[PDB]
């Protein structure tokens, strides 16, 4: 059933970048379920989990073509809970 | 604006017995911020704090005349965050 | 990959009382992964999530058959996530 | 240095009973670390950690000439992290 | 009535750049309570909420003529709730 | 007892650089428990507390000669919980 999320909104130069790939690969290293996406106002990510080390290192490690302008946070509701991270 | 709530639904004996005053001592006693209310389908309590504290001495001090036959949990989102403690 | 789990193990009168299908339902409710078994000294549960809530609900809504005479809870690592909770 | 504590306060039938061994028994089960003592207001326990558990052990293993008529908790500051539990 | 804060202390050129606003501007985006005050000894600030995004925020999103050389955080008990986020 | 822990593997230029002395000064400033070393594949860092803040120091005031390409983070089970933060 369902469970508190977040929802996280990043923007800047974030297409045609590697970054939905790049937030694939650092959510299967944090052991993190969710999905990605880039509907037109920049990625939106969801997360089951708590996203604080995903941020830190979402920054830190910005694949070198892209660049983060800004990152906002909302809570949502999970419908059902994921079981993987995919990109969608 | 938007934060991670949780509504609790408590279901038995549950009116005509003192119920609301005691969820609004017990937040108060607990510093916890939200409101209760009984829609017909028992005492619906909202709160913008981790339940547990509260979940257990809800149990543990139910009034004499009320008694506790199931107690649900679910997650929502405040759309404003609470102030105080209120009986609605 | 791995996460920090929760293991409680439950003894007391708890077997032939329903009390595996009591702890999956009670999962169920509360939205719980991980599993529950009788290995012989006791009841094991082991959860993805904070056993709290769980904890308080297992005490209070007790089969009428049966008795918890102790619980004690420690930590583990899952080495995969469960996405249901299961009888096993 | 400092870090954020929780004190309970336990009032009741709570001196000549055995609780502050059933408290200090409890912690260890737990591994929580603080200390319990009786001032003449019941007993208080301070806790390193989140009460949440030992709250609901607390109530439903009380020893038998014990009875707990109410719990409150506030926060409190610890000036240096307790390593044991102790009964001062 | 009381509950545990964090007290952020940061210093570096952190006055005549913005930051006070920048600090109120971030805690509005993240929905934090408390203040922000410049004491002599860079910018204190005090949150209700955990502070680790606001952290990784401040850090990388710091105003152009700002600069951050260190930031210490410690626990502290708020006397009553904040409701809002002001500059101080 | 046994306890939650977090083990971070910290990867780079991150020896002869200072690196071990930097994490006690964090972890001594930020009141955190565990311990760091060198063990051939970058620095190993465990800890008792949560590692949010301190994975936000470690990369923003990383020491000069250092670099920090990859932080990856895992859960294990401490046997006995750390009372110090000790270079090893
Ligand atoms: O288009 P992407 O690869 O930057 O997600
Ligand atoms: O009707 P109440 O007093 O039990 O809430
Ligand atoms: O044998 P059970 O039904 O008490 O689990
Ligand atoms: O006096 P005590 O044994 O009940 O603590
Ligand atoms: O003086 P401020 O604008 O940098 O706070
Ligand atoms: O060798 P270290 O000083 O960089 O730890």
Not at 34 to 50: K, P, S
Not at 52 to 62: A, P, T, W
Request: charged residues 25%.
């Amino acid at each position: 059933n369902t469970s508190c999320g977040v929802q996280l909104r990043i923007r800047g130069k974030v297409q045609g970048v590697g970054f939905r790939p790049f937030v694939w690969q650092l959510a299967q290293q944090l052991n993190l379920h969710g999905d990605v996406c880039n509907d037109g106002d920049g990625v939106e990510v969801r997360l089951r989990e708590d996203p604080e080390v995903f941020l830190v290192q979402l920054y830190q490690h910005c694949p070198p073509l892209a660049r983060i302008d800004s990152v906002e946070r909302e809570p949502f509701i999970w419908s059902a809970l994921p079981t993987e991270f995919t990109i969608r």
